[PDB]
């Protein structure tokens, strides 16, 4: 299965945003993250990634597709607008195993509620 995400300056959940900031897939599934605006990037969060996956980060202003494989939940960031809250997350399977690891990651306060937010809508 093939998902776009779009990076935007605003959208549902207000500004700096990933839309949707949820999504669930099955290993092999490959998401486009398309900078819809101009001024965004994808970047993986550290430590909010499956161990073993591989971290990845793309260019400013670059439609960037990712194929998933390793299942759990994967945080994401817009490079320059982590502080501002521009984060989603991708979660490949149900009952992700490193759910609690990525729970006690580190991350600004709006990228955290925004995250928090993300992991609920995945049924976590
Ligand atoms: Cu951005």
Redesign the pocket.
Known sequence: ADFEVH?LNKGKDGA?VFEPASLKVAPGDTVTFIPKDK???VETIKGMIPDGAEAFKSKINENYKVTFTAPGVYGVK?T??YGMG?VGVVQVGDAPANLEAVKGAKNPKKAQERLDAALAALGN
Request: hydrophobic fraction near 35%; include cysteine.
């Open positions: 990076m700096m001024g965004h990037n817009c320059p607008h521009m």
